[PDB]
Structure formats: C-alpha cells, structure tokens
C-alpha cells in the first residue's frame, strides 16, 4: 500500500521514522505523501492533528495511526517499542478500522467558508465584548455574553472541552458538545450554564449582536474573521478512520491519562 | 381505547380530571386502571413519575401524556386549557409516539433485585463513609470516595444530574450519564471529576470496599439495602412512549424552564 | 507542664505514644488527661478532631499539636521521626503559639443548643426535600432548595468545603465560608450559586419552610434534630491554639497534600 | 468643596449631570476636574471604573459616589431620582466614608511598571500556550497551564471572578482571590483547581517558562507586554473611599443584582 510518515521533528521521532521506513522497505509498501492509504504519525496528539489536516480531503481512503514518543496521547496511543510489530501487520493488511465523528463549522460573511475539526472549534471576540445570540434549530435559545463558546467532538471532549467543565463521552456516540467560557449571569443576562449535547442533524447557529469580528479556531489553526453574519455548527457526515491491531478501550485511555498509568 | 387518569390530589387537578372523564364519556373510550392503553397524568413531573412506576410492567402497550396544573414540567408539558382538545385527538387516534431511553439498575447481595428509572438512580452510604470501586466494562477505572454517585437518563439530565454539574443531552440519544457528588481529590484519592456519558451496552459496576450498606434510590423511591455485593448500571432495552399532538422540542422545553417563558 | 496523648488505636500509634511518654518521663512533665496544658494527637486529622472536641471547654489553656502516622494531615503535620525532638522543646517551653478561627453553630427549637466546629457544619433534610430561607444579618437573601449547605472554617476549607467547589483561604483570615450542595436553579428557584465569605460579626440564619427536622453535623458528630425553629452561623470568639517549633506555611501544606510531596 | 462629574455620554446621563451642576451652583461648591474632593460618576460600573483611574493618584483626598442611569451597579448604586437629595448632603458634609481594598500589580522586564486595580487583573498568552510557574511567598506552588489567571479584589469578586467560579467575599475583608481559567489537569500537569484567598502582605509571583509575552489587563485597560521576567500580585496599601448617605449592605446589592430586585 501507499504510506507516509510524519515526525515531530526531534531526534527520537526522526530516528524511529527512518527505522519504520527501512522496515517497510522489506515489504510491498510504497512511500507516497500525495495519495497515501496509511498515514503514520510519530510524536504526540498535536503531531497527529497536523497529519489529519494535511489529508482531510482524503479521509475516506486513509486509515490513520499514531505513535507517541512522549507520554500517552489519545490519538497517538502506540509505544515506540511496538513500531516493528506495527510494520508487520500493516503490510499483511486484514486489520480492522474504527471511525470517530467529526464537527463541521460553516462561517458566513457579507460567501461561505467551511472547516472540519477533530477536537473542537471555539469562538472569541477580538478586543471588545463577546455577545452572540444562540439559535438551536432555527429557534432562539439564549443570548450568551462572556469569553466565548466551545463546540467539541466526541473524541475531543478529553481536551479543551474537559477543562471547561464539559463531560467525557464515548467516541462511538455521533454527537457534539457545547460548553461555555466564563458566562455572565445576572438578572439581565441568562445563560443555561450546563453543557449541551446535540445529536446528529441538529444545527447550532451563532449570530452577532454588536461587533462582527470574531477570533475563530479549528483545532490548532486560529484566524481572525471580519464581518461575520453567522456561525453554524453541526455533526459532519465525514468520519476519521483508524487502524486497530489490539483492544485499547477509550475508557482505559482515559484512566491511563488522568487516573494513573 | 382503555384509559386512566391520575391526579395530584388537589382541587385544580381533581376538577380537571373529572372534566376529561366526562369529555371522554362522549366517545368510544373506556376507563380502566388495570390494562390501560392511554395513561394521563395531571399535576406535575412528580405526579408523572408515579404514573410511570404504576405501570412499568406494561410500558410497551401504553402511551403516556402529562398535564401540568402548575409550572411547565418536562414530562407534563400540556397546559390545562388544552385538555378539551386533548380528549378529541386521543379518541380519533392516528397520533404519533415518541420514545425515550431508560436506565436499568441491578443490585446483587449474598439474589438479584432490578429496577427501572426514568430520571436517575443514586447511591449513598448509610452513616459511614462512601467508598466504592468503579468498574467500567470489567475494567477497574477509579476508586471513588465522596458523598455518592448519580447515573442519569437522557431526559433525566435536566433534573438532579443538572444540579451536580452534568450536561444536558437530547433524549433521542441512547446513553446514560454518570456524575459525582462531592468527590475527594488529594494525592491519595484520584477521581476523574468530569461527567461520563456511556453508550448502549456499556456496563458500569459499583463494588464496595469496606461498608456493604448503601442508600440506593430510583427516581422517587429510596430504600436501604444491606450486604450489597455489586451495583450494575446500563441502558435499558425498554423505552417509555409518549403521545404527541404538536411539536414541542426538547430544547424549547429547556428554554422555557431555565431561560424564560 | 500537664500533658496528655491520644492515639489512633493501632500499633504504630500506640507504640509511638508510649515512647513519647517515656521520653516525657525524663523531664518535669506530668501526665494528666483532666486539665492538660499540652494535648498531643497521634494518628491523623480525624484523631486530631477528636482531641479538639474532648477539650473544647479548655481551649484557652491548651496548645494542640498533631503527629501523622499515615499521610500528611493539615492538623497532624509532624513526622513520627520528629517525636523525640518534639519532647525536648515541649519541656523547655519558650515555643510560639498560632491561633485559628472557629465556627459557632446555634440551634433553636420550640431552648438553645450551641456547638463549636473546627472544620465545618452542614445541614441536610431527613427524608423529605430540603428547603430553607437564608437570612443574612436579618435580611432575607435567598430560598435555598437542594441537598444542603456547608459553613466552613478557614482551616476547614481544605476539606468538605473544597469538595463542594469552595475556595481555600488562609487560616489567618477571621471569616467563614458558605457553599451549596446541589442547588436547584430553574425559573422559580433562584440561588446565588457562588460561595460566600462572611467576615466577623456577620450572622447567617437558616429558617425552615415546610419540614422542621434536619440532619445537622458538626465536624464528625452528626445528630438528628426535631422541631428546629432556626439555625444560626457566625464566627466564634474562641480560637484553637497550636504549638509551633518550625515554619510550615499553610500554602506549603496545601502543596504537599494536593500537588505533590 | 471642589467636585466634578463624569457622564456615560448619552442624553439620560448628560441631562442629569447638568441638573446636578445647577443644583450644586446653589451651594458653596466649586467645579474642578483637576483637584476635586468629590467625584460623582453617572452611568454604570464601567463609567465608575473610568472615574477611578482618572484620579488614582489622589485616592486619599477623594470620596467617590456613583449613580446608575441603567440597572443597579455595585459601585453606581444610586437611583437618578435621588440626585437632588444627594446634592444637599454633599454640600452640608458630615457624611461617613467607606473604604474598600485594592490590588497592586507589579510587572518586571529585562525596569518596573506598577498598576492599581479596583476589580481584577488577568494574565493571558499572546498566541502561543500560557505556561507559568506560580510562586507564593518565595515558595514554588504549582506550574499552571491553561488560558490564564485572574487575581480579584474583594469588591471585584462579583464580576469576572464570579464567572470563573470564584467566591464572593465581603469588601470589608482585606484580601485578594486568585482563580483559574480552563486549567489542564492530566497525569503530568497538576493545578490546585480551587480558588485561593490570600491575606494582606502575601505575594503571589507569576514567572514565565517558555514564552515571555503576556496580554495583561487591569480592570478595563489591556496592553501587551514583551519580555516579562515576573508578575507580582499583592494587596495594595491604598484604598478607595466612598460617600455613604444611607445603609446599602453589600449582601443586599448582591441580592438585588443576582436574585431579584
Ligand atoms: N483529543 C485530545 N484529548 C486529550 N488531549 C489532547 C487531545 N488533543 C490534543 Br492536541 N491533546 C493534548 C492537549 C494538550 O495536553
Ligand atoms: N426530568 C426532570 N427534569 C427536570 N425537572 C424534573 C424532572 N423530573 C422531575 Br420530578 N423534575 C422536577 C424536580 C423538582 O423541580
Ligand atoms: N481540615 C482538613 N483539611 C483537609 N483534610 C481534612 C481536614 N480535616 C480532616 Br478529618 N481531613 C481529612 C478528610 C478525609 O481525607
Ligand atoms: N465590581 C463589579 N461587580 C459586578 N459587576 C461589575 C463590576 N464592575 C463592573 Br464594570 N461590572 C459590570 C460587568 C459587566 O456586567
């Protein structure tokens, strides 16, 4: 199969990348970073996030796999000592694939710019206060005033969603979770406070009230947007595909990362 | 059809119950509280919870409907002025049914006692400290020490789950949410802190460490259990059925109850 | 001086108690558990709490000191290997004393029963719902409905107050902190949600609305009270006195207990 | 006395300002915005914050007073219909003064720049991650990694400190409260999580780990700082002075703003 490997850039990751390429050279495996079928990430969850966005236009023809040269990540969950055993079963094929949901973010101006997220997508104000009207399925739900909002994916709930008080949900659930960022709640402003979990086909629409400039982020990339008319969130129809060679439950990766390993 | 109506017990609810019975008398409707097909609850969410547990052995042959003589409830979401219009379409049939998930709670001693919950099921200690080992799908996940735990249904997240910091999830999602109750987190005890959302077929098992007596509750009923060997939580295969005559979205019932009506 | 020593009851604590008594026998020290001037606690924070309530009627003539035979406590913060060096400077005197504030709890029926707390004092409902009217300095502030309330001392903020979301305050601040326990907040019930810190001479008064029976606790002891007309909280005029032989800052005991030791 | 009046800038505030000036003209009152002894703020809490920073170099010779032409503020807590009665007792003098604590913020580069805050002072990262080492009284306490930190004044706890989960403390307590902003807590990063209340003479020092650029704010003004070597927080020796003509308790201003008015 066509494969490619990215690296964090340091010695420990670059040396292991060259060893796996040499190990792949002993098989019927061709290196290609244009149309690969197996994308291997060596480094951390941040390195895996870059590998996802490098090939987000070919998500259906790619099976991702991550290797953590540091601590255990949620996407890079393979120890470096298992790289030689990974090269074997990747060439023999017959492996199973797991699919996680994704978040679609549509921005509208006065055209349309869409994005795909693996972790979350946040919205902040550039300088002035952040005040938006939250509309759920064409129905006005609340007028949020605070630092911002965060719409997270199922597998992304263990990251920024978790630090904001959100709940951890199993990645087999096709849903998205919205959490607040330091909301103001007096007798004049009223937010729900609790995190909200939306199923598929539900559309959450953010609409400005005064300022039209917002600092929007998708995973790692963050870019200022000007004259925003609407921000739409919804579960994406596309999914990310992983390659599994052993049982590593999500709740066990949660235990090893937050309880003890 | 066979129908029956329960009441909160006060004048406002008893008078409306007698008016609907007289209104049902003008149709091909028979009153029967033994094997009814339409169970009407007049009062509040607590009155609706009693109507659910009165007929939990016939959930598949019953379509529930609630009327709130006080403030708007999440289960009793029909104004009293709409009772006459309810009697009409209930006799003509051809109405649609909505189904919400349920929570199954199994308790084991040294036999087995099972329960069905519409809102949540909590576990506390009777007197001494509450220390249990949390096991998710046969894998030990954490040793919880605190006041207790709360496993909630999707439609039950707006109640006790919400007061504990849990997230609100749409009742169309077949899942269950576990939240903590004043957990201790020092350098010796370590809990996850975040609420956890489990999909179908996931089993969360609570196991004692020292004391074996627990104060377990299912919705409104709460009874002391002695010599408990295990407590098992999982999404139930049975569901509760409602009768809909108009579009009342869950997110709009959340708005009218917590934002403003 | 007159001294006495309590023990957790196990070997490790009983053996160290007998060694310190023999070490005290080599000095001008008399053992007396009736009117002691130095109360030594060997065990943990729970053992120290028992030593405090055994002699709460003589707080002004006693300097407490705690030894932890297990993990580091906030009151028992002396390693067992320092017991021999403790016996020396306790006989030579000339040591400094530190004073921490206390919480006074007054209960009224239809007489008066007062209590003194070192950590916190909580109020719960016995069976039915818990609904009380919170009155701050004769002014009605809110109608709380939930599991209960917790009024904590400065040094007690690191315990049950911390698990409820309360803030940690330095024990040199003469104040008390009130936190909530799973409060209900809809469009009909409205609580402040945030913890409240009251200075000296402020009186927080809890008054029943329906049920008059409450499950009140003071530190470790918890007893049911019937026909309660009012519950009054205020910072006590009495303080607890410790014996210091080295600088152990409160913020360093917080670090070693929750960050890492 | 020498006095001056600021306005929000709209009709309702400008008209009331001209009426009070004409009302002051009937007395022995001189208008002067250079060295005033009575600073009157008409508008809201934001307008009052501007009046404080306009004359922060003369805090000991000024008694502030605020008028809210909109909703009730915590600093502007006088209804417009009471302006005529304010002009009377302000000229007759013999009024009492109330004093609230302040927060001192010192920034060091590679000189020193100091600031005075009435509400709070926050620190964020400009672009990259925010990682600082928190040092309390020359002792390392934790390595914070997240969005940022917020050090609040007693009277400022009802604002941004409240939205971050902090506690509300009476302004008669000379202290400062530090809260977190979406902290990361895994098996490698460990923060206290709970808010911290520091008494007078305690110094909290923030020190960079990688990036040296921070987005620091003091009340409303926010300015980027480059090559920061340290950030020091401590309770200020200076206080702000108000003019009281009636009893308006802090806990009652909390009730009217968050419960109901
Ligand atoms: N999905 C994720 N779950 C947990 N952690 C994550 C995730 N993605 C990244 Br990048 N990280 C690391 C954040 C800095 O510790
Ligand atoms: N599922 C529910 N969601 C919200 N509220 C509820 C629910 N069930 C009951 Br009973 N209540 C009323 C609790 C006391 O206000
Ligand atoms: N004041 C206290 N601060 C922290 N912890 C405490 C305190 N008192 C006791 Br008892 N503990 C132990 C509780 C069970 O871990
Ligand atoms: N000290 C303060 N307490 C409460 N609220 C405040 C304060 N200062 C200002 Br400005 N506000 C208004 C913030 C936007 O509602």
The answer to whether the annotation marks C241 as part of a ligand binding site is: no
User: Would the annotation count B152 as a binding residue?
Assistant: no
Structural domain boundaries in chain A = 1-101+238-261, 102-237
Counted residue by residue, chain D has a size of: 261
Reduce the DSSP state of residue A209 to 3 states and report it.
Answer: coil
For residues D30, D33, D35 and D40, what is the CA-based torsion angle, rounded to 10 degrees? 80
Residue reference for tokens 């002051």: D24
CA-nearest of B137, B138, B166, B135 to B150 is B166
Chain B residue with CA closest to C258: the answer is: B186
Radius of gyration of chain B (CA): 20
Determine whether the interchain pair B254/A202 forms a contact, defined as Cβ–Cβ distance below 8 Å: no
Structure tokens that stand for C125 in this block: 């409902």
Q: Is the dihedral of CA A227, A231, A237, A239 positive or negative?
A: positive
A219 as an active site residue: the answer is no
Neighbours of D167 (CB within 10 A): 27
Contact by Cβ (8 Å): A76, A12 = no
- From residue A236, alpha-carbon distances to A57, A230, B171 in Å are 13, 18, 20
The three-state secondary structure class of D219 is: coil
Which three-class secondary structure state does DSSP give residue D21? helix
Q: Using CB atoms within 10 A of its CB, is residue C128 exposed (0-12), middle (13-18) or buried (19+)?
A: exposed
For residue D189, give the 3-state DSSP assignment: coil
Instruction: Give D256's DSSP letter.
Output: I
Whether the CA torsion A81, A84, A87, A93 is positive or negative: it is negative
Kindly state the tokens that stand for D12. Answer: 């309702």
Query: In sequence order, what are the beta bridge partners of C31?
Result: C3
Cβ-contact B129, B177 below 8 angstroms: no
Are residues C178 and C153 in contact, defined by beta-carbon separation less than 8 angstroms?
no
Residue A48: strand, helix, or coil = helix
Residue B239 contacts by C-beta under 8 Å, 6 or more apart in sequence? B59, B99, B100, B101, B102
Helices A11-25 and A83-92 pack at an angle, to 10 degrees, of 40
Q: In angstroms, rounded to a whole number, what is the distance separating the alpha carbons of residues A256 and B141?
A: 9
In eight-state DSSP terms, residue A151 is E
Q: Which residues line ligand 1 (CB under 6 A)?
A: A 45-46, 49, 74, 119, 155-156, 158-159; D 184
Calculated CA dihedral for residues B209, B215, B218, B223, nearest 10 degrees: 130
- Given a contact cutoff of 8 angstroms between Cβ atoms, the answer to whether B53 and B64 are in contact is no
> Which residues, listed in sequence order, are joined to residue C39 by a DSSP beta bridge?
C4, C64
| Residue located via tokens 């895996």 | A48
Q: Using CA atoms, how far apart are residues C146 and C123, in angstroms rounded to an integer?
A: 11
Length of chain A: 261
Q: In a 3-state reduction of DSSP, which class is residue A147?
A: coil
Contact in structure between D184 and A71 (CB atoms under 8 Å): no
Neighbours of D22 (CB within 10 A): 10
Alpha helices per DSSP H over D93-217: 160-163
Ligand 3 atom with the smallest distance to the CA of C119 is: 1
Give the alpha-carbon dihedral of D19, D25, D30, D32, to 10 degrees: 30
Torsion of CA D48, D53, D55, D57, to 10 degrees: 150
Q: How far is CA D139 from CA B52, C77, C249, C261, in A?
A: 59, 18, 10, 14
CB D117 within 8 A of CB D152: no
Could you say which ligand is closest to the alpha carbon of residue C43?
A: 3
Sheet holding C120-125, edge to edge: C221-225, C214-218, C120-125, C148-152, C175-181, C196-199, D168-169
User: From ligand 1's centre to the CA of A176, what distance in Å?
Assistant: 17
Q: Is B120 annotated as a binding residue?
A: yes
Q: How far apart are CA C105 and CA C118, in angstroms?
A: 11
Residue D19 CB neighbour total at 10 angstroms: 14
Pick the closest to residue C36 from C219, C248, C243 (CA basis): C243
10 Å CB burial of residue A194 (0-12, 13-18, 19+) is: buried
> In which element (H, E) is residue A3 found?
strand A2-7
Ligand having the closest approach to the CA of A240: 1
**If you count them, how many residues does chain C have?**
261
For residue D163, give the nearest of A183, A257, A259 by CB distance: A183
Determine contact, residues A206/A132, Cβ cutoff 8 Å: yes
Contact C151, C202 (CB under 8 A): no
For an interface test with B, the pick among A178, A193, A194 (most B C-beta atoms closer than 10 Å) comes out as A194
Specify which residues D206 forms β-bridges with.
D134, D231
Name residues whose C-beta falls within 8 Å of residue C107's C-beta, 6 or more positions apart in sequence.
C113, C114, C115, C216, C225, C228, C230, C231, C232
Q: Return the closest-CA partner of residue C157 out of C103, C203, C115, C107.
A: C103
Which chain C residue has the Cα nearest residue B258?
C186
Q: Which tokens go with B16?
A: 């409306």
CB-based contact B167 A173, cutoff 8 Å? no
Give me the DSSP letters along chain B. -EEEEEE-SSHHHHHHHHHHHHHHHTTT-EE-SSS-SEEEEEE-HHHHHHHHHHTGGGGGG-EEEEEESSSPPSS----GGGHHHHHHHHHH---EEEEE--EEEEEE---EEEEEESSEEEEEESSS-EEEEEEETTEEEEEEEESEEEEE-TGGGGTHHHHTTPPEE-TTS-EEEEEEES---SSS-----S-EEEETT--EEEEESS---EEEEETTEEEEE-S--EEEEEE-S--EEEEESS---HHHHHIIIII--
Kindly tell me the sign of the dihedral angle through the C-alpha atoms of D68, D72, D77, D79.
positive
Q: State both tokens at B12.
A: 């406002």
State whether residue D247 is helix, strand or coil: coil
- Positions of E strands within chain D: 2-7, 30-31, 38-43, 63-68, 96-100, 103-108, 112-117, 120-125, 130-136, 139-146, 148-152, 168-169, 175-181, 196-199, 204-208, 214-218, 221-225, 230-235, 240-244
Chain A residues closer than 8 Å to B260 by CB: 190
CA B136 to chain centre: 22
The reply to whether CATH 3.20.20.140 applies to domain C102-237 is no
Decide whether any atom of ligand 4 lies within 6 Å of the D47 Cβ. no
Helical axes D83-92 vs D11-25, angle rounded to 10°: 40
> Looking at beta carbons, which residues of chain B come within 8 Å of A249?
137, 139
Measured distance CA(A138)–CA(B71) in Å, rounded: 25
Q: What is the resolution of this structure in A?
A: 2.5
Catalytic one of B45, B77, B84, B138: B45
Which residues lie closer than 8 Å to A144 by C-beta, 6 or more apart? Answer: A130, A131, A132, A133, A134, A180, A183, A191
The angle at the Cα of D90, spanning D88 to D92, to the nearest 5 degrees, equals 70
Q: Obtained via which technique? A: X-ray
Q: How far apart are CA C119 and CA C117, in angstroms?
A: 6
Q: Known binder of ligand: residue A222?
A: no
What span, in angstroms and rounded, lies between the C-alpha atoms of A229 and D8? 29
Which residues, 6+ apart, have CB-to-CB distance to C25 below 8 Å?
A: none
Neighbours of A50 (CB within 10 A): 15
d(CA B238, CA B59): 8
Distance CA C33, CA C54 (A): 10
Beta-carbon-side half-sphere exposure of residue B200 (alpha carbons within 13 Å): 10
Each as own residue / partner, the long-range contacts of residues C53-56 (CB below 8 Å, 24 or more positions apart, any chain) are C53/C219, C53/C220, C53/C221, C54/C6, C56/C116
Yes or no: say if A152 and A74 are a contact pair by the CB < 8 Å rule. no
In angstroms, rounded to a whole number, what is the distance separating the alpha carbons of residues B49 and C19?
62
Identify the chains in contact with C, defined as 3+ C-beta pairs within 8 A: B, D
Angle at D155 between CA D154 and CA D157, to 5 degrees: 70
Q: How far is CA C240 from CA C39, C92, C201, D182, in A?
A: 12, 22, 18, 37
Measured in angstroms, the CA of A163 and the nearest CA of chain D are apart by 5
CA distance C250 to C45: 15
The answer for residues whose C-beta is within 8 angstroms of residue C119's C-beta and 6 or more apart is: C49, C152, C153, C155, C156, C159, C160, C219
CB D51 within 8 A of CB D41: yes
Q: CA-CA distance, D144 to D178, in Å (whole number)?
A: 12
Separation in Å, CA B252 to CA B98, C183, C190, D94: 16, 22, 20, 56
Tell me, what DSSP letter sits at residue A61? Answer: G
User: Which residues have a C–N gap over 2.5 Å right after them in chain B?
Assistant: 110
For chain C, the first-to-last Cα distance in angstroms comes to: 35
A88 CB contacts (<8 Å, ≥6 apart)? none
- Decide: B45 in ligand 2 pocket, CB within 6 A: yes
Cα A178 off chain centre by: 14
The CA R_g of chain D, rounded to the nearest whole Å, is 20
Q: Judge contact between C232 and C204, C-beta under 8 A.
A: yes
Cα–ligand 4 centroid distance for D158 (angstroms) = 7
Query: Which residues are bridge partners to D131 per DSSP?
Result: D145
Q: Count CB-CB contacts under 10 A for residue C88.
A: 12
Q: Is C210 on the interface with D (CB under 8 A)?
A: no
Q: Which residue has the tokens 């979350």?
A: A120
The answer to whether B189 and B142 have CB atoms below 8 angstroms apart is no
- Set of chain A residues whose Cβ sits within 8 Å of the Cβ of B192: 168, 254, 258-259
- CA triple D9-D15-D21, angle to 5 deg: 105
Chain B residues with CB-CB distance to A168 below 8 A: 192, 194-197
Q: Which structure tokens are listed for B176?
A: 């269950």
- Cα D149 to chain centroid distance, Å, stands at 16
φ/ψ of A155, rounded to 5, equals: -70, -20
- How far CA A111 is from CA of A114, A236, A239, D188, in Å, comes to 10, 20, 25, 44
- Find the DSSP H helices in D26-76: 45-54
Count of Cβ atoms closer than 10 Å to residue B114 Cβ? 12
Q: What is the DSSP string of chain C?
A: -EEEEEE-SSHHHHHHHHHHHHHHHTTT-EE-SSS-SEEEEEE-HHHHHHHHHHTGGGGGG-EEEEEESSSPPSS----GGGHHHHHHHHHH---EEEEE--EEEEEE---EEEEEESSEEEEEESSS-EEEEEEETTEEEEEEEESEEEEE-TGGGGTHHHHTTPPEE-TTS-EEEEEEES---SSS-----S-EEEETT--EEEEESS---EEEEETTEEEEE-S--EEEEEE-S--EEEEESS---HHHHHHHHHT--
Comparing alpha-carbon positions, the chain B residue that sits nearest to C159 is B184
Q: Residue A66, annotated ligand binder? A: no
Q: In whole angstroms, what separates CA C43 from the centre of its chain?
A: 16
Residue pair C40/C68 in contact (Cβ under 8 Å)? The answer is no
Give the pair of three-digit tokens for residue C161. 């107050």
DSSP state of D73: P
Is B39 within 8 Å of B73 (Cβ atoms)? Answer: no
Q: Supply angle C-alpha D161, D166, D171, rounded to 5.
A: 70
The SS3 assignment for D81 reads helix
Cα C82 to middle of ligand 3, angstroms: 22
Q: Helix C11-25 and helix C83-92: axis angle, to 10°?
A: 40
Q: Are A156 and A48 in contact (CB under 8 A)?
A: no
**Residue among A71, A160, A259 whose CB faces D188 most closely:** A71
Query: If DSSP codes are grouped into helix, strand and coil, which group holds residue A63?
Result: strand
Angle between the B11-25 and B83-92 helix axes, to the nearest 10 degrees? Answer: 40
Residue B206 structure tokens? 């609570």
Catalytic amino acids of C?
45
Q: Check if the beta carbon of residue A166 is closer than 8 Å to that of residue A152.
A: yes
């Amino acid at each position: 199969m066509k494969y490619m490997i990215t690296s964090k850039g340091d010695e420990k990751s670059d040396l292991l990348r060259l060893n796996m390429i040499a190990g792949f050279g002993e098989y019927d495996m061709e290196y290609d970073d244009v149309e690969p079928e197996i994308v291997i990430s060596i480094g951390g969850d941040g390195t895996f996030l870059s590998a996802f966005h490098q090939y987000e236009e070919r998500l259906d023809e790619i099976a991702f796999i991550g290797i953590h040269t540091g601590h255990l990540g949620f996407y890079a969950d393979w120890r470096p000592a298992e790289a030689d055993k990974l090269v074997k079963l990747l060439a023999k094929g017959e492996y199973q694939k797991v699919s996680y949901p994704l978040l679609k973010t549509t921005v509208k101006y006065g055209k349309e710019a869409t994005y795909l997220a693996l972790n979350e997508s946040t919205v902040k104000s550039s300088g002035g206060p952040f005040v938006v009207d939250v509309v759920i399925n064409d129905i006005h739900f609340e007028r949020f005033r605070g630092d911002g909002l965060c719409m997270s994916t199922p597998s992304g709930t263990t990251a920024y969603n978790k630090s904001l008080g959100g709940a951890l949900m199993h990645p087999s659930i096709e849903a998205m979770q919205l959490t607040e960022m330091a909301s103001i709640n007096n007798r004049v402003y009223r937010t729900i406070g609790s995190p909200l979990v939306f199923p598929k086909h539900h559309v959450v629409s953010l609409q400005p009230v005064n300022d039209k400039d917002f600092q929007i982020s998708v995973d790692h990339l963050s870019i200022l947007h000007r004259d925003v008319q609407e921000i739409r969130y919804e579960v994406s129809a596309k999914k990310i595909h992983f390659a599994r060679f052993r049982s590593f439950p999500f709740w066990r990766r949660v235990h090893d990362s937050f309880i003890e390993d």
